Amino acid sequence: YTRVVWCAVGPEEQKKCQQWSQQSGQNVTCATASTTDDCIVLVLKGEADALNLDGGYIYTAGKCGLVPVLAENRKSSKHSSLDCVLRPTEGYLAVAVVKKANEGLTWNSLKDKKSCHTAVDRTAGWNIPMGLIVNQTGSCAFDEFFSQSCAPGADPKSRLCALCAGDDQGLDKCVPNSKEKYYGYTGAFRCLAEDVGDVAFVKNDTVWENTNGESTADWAKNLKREDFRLLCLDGTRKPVTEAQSCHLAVAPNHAVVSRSDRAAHVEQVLLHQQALFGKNGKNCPDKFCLFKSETKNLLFNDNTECLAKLGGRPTYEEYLGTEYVTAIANLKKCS
Amino acid sequence: LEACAF
Ligand SMILES: *[C@@H]1O[C@H](CO)[C@@H](O[C@@H]2O[C@H](CO)[C@@H](O)[C@H](O)[C@H]2NC(C)=O)[C@H](O)[C@H]1NC(C)=O
Ligand SMILES: *[C@@H]1O[C@H](CO)[C@@H](O[C@@H]2O[C@H](CO)[C@@H](O)[C@H](O)[C@H]2NC(C)=O)[C@H](O)[C@H]1NC(C)=O
Ligand SMILES: *[C@@H]1O[C@H](CO)[C@@H](O)[C@H](O)[C@H]1NC(C)=O
Ligand SMILES: C[C@@H](N)[C@H](O)c1ccccc1
Ligand SMILES: [Fe+3]
Ligand SMILES: [Zn+2]
Ligand SMILES: [Zn+2]
Numbered sequence: 001y002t003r004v005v006w007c008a009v010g011p012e013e014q015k016k017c018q019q020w021s022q023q024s025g026q027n028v029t030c031a032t033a034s035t036t037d038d039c040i041v042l043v044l045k046g047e048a049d050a051l052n053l054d055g056g057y058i059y060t061a062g063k064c065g066l067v068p069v070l071a072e073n074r075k076s077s078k079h080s081s082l083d084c085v086l087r088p089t090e091g092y093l094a095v096a097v098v099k100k101a102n103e104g105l106t107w108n109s110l111k112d113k114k115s116c117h118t119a120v121d122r123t124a125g126w127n128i129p130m131g132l133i134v135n136q137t138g139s140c141a142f143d144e145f146f147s148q149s150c151a152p153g154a155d156p157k158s159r160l161c162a163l164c165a166g167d168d169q170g171l172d173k174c175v176p177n178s179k180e181k182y183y184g185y186t187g188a189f190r191c192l193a194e195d196v197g198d199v200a201f202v203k204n205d206t207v208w209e210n211t212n213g214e215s216t217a218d219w220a221k222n223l224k225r226e227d228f229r230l231l232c233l234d235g236t237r238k239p240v241t242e243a244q245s246c247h248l249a250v251a252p253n254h255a256v257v258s259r260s261d262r263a264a265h266v267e268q269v270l271l272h273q274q275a276l277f278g279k280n281g282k283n284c285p286d287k288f289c290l291f292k293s294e295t296k297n298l299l300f301n302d303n304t305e306c307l308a309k310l311g312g313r314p315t316y317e318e319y320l321g322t323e324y325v326t327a328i329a330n331l332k333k334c335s
Numbered sequence: 336l337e338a339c340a341f
Contacts, residue, residue: 064339
């Protein structure tokens with residue numbers, strides 16, 4: 001046993017991490033970087049122990065030798081008989097969302113439209129949709145498909161960043177961290193909600209959690225699910241209640257990664273930390289809730305019920321699944 | 336397209 005150094009991406013995650021550190025009595029301390037890739041590097045250098053990552057980032061981390069430790073597990077879809085920590089993870093639904101009022105828009109008329117992405121390299125926001133588009137257009141010029149986009153992590157002066165807004169002060173336009181107004185699941189959905197973009201590439205859960213009163217945030221408090229539609233691959237449009245039959249793919253759950261030589265220890269500490277601050281945790285809500293951050297999904301997605309043990313001590317390729325790994329590989333050929 | 340991007 002020892003202290004686990006978490007890596008926070010950006011100043012807001014840093015703040016939440018500091019609160020967690022304080023409440024844990026320094027059982028967890030914080031390192032902070034401006035981007036997920038920088039955090040991946042801190043971990044590789046041994047300057048940080050771990051962080052929770054989207055599948056696309058797990059691919060980057062895995063290539064560099066980091067391993068998955070525990071996976072996010074949400075309010076179980078499959079009516080189970082096992083505890084959350086032991087429950088297998090199902091995966092989330094990557095979807096393409098548009099405004100119902102934007103009537104002519106389908107998967108087949110996306111070219112030259114405006115797009116909102118969680119961030120370059122992320123599963124639902126980038127790898128799945130751009131991999132599909134590259135494949136279908138038979139062209140690697142995915143940076144010329146949409147007329148403008150907000151794809152945090154791309155070149156700030158490029159069309160891929162044209163729609164990004166930066167922070168309060170209008171600084172950090174397109175940075176791949178929560179300071180960018182349209183970053184992540186909620187940022188990309190907001191980009192759609194405010195009609196900055198024509199389509200948003202997020203997950204099923206994002207639409208639900210930010211509509212019909214689920215979010216009191218000012219830009220989301222008035223959003224109605226009926227005002228949105230999902231784009232299915234067969235060219236049809238469906239209500240957001242049909243994500244099961246109208247998604248782009250099933251994505252592997254975000255998961256915690258660490259150096260192989262620190263994995264066992266990181267796992268031990270996290271399992272204990274969630275007993276304290278997770279859902280129903282001894283000290284949540286009274287003191288600190290590890291899986292809450294007012295829909296900002298800081299450190300962990302807010303809809304996380306618990307971090308679950310993995311089956312079969314999977315390598316990053318096994319955790320992500322061969323198909324997805326090859327999909328990423330294929331897309332990477334373009335850059 | 337196969338080693339660590341760092
Ligand atoms: C898409 O996401 C929503 C929101 O996560 C799912 O609805 C939650 O589903 C659980 C369990 O099925 C319910 O107990 C909650 O009440 C729902 N939350 C809300 C805010 O409505 C929905 O099932 C998901 N759909 C698919 C196909 O996965
Ligand atoms: C884009 O197309 C490529 C080529 O079909 C897909 O890669 C293939 O995936 C199949 C099914 O998983 C594998 O058996 C093949 O070996 C892959 N081919 C190659 C060239 O490696 C890829 O999955 C597609 N991308 C997306 C996101 O669908
Ligand atoms: C801090 O970690 C030590 C070692 O496991 C443990 O004894 C103590 O109960 C932990 N406290 C908190 C609040 O995390
Ligand atoms: C794809 C499969 N090998 C993986 O374990 C998985 C499943 C659901 C969610 C996350 C991850
Ligand atoms: Fe994701
Ligand atoms: Zn499917
Ligand atoms: Zn294995």
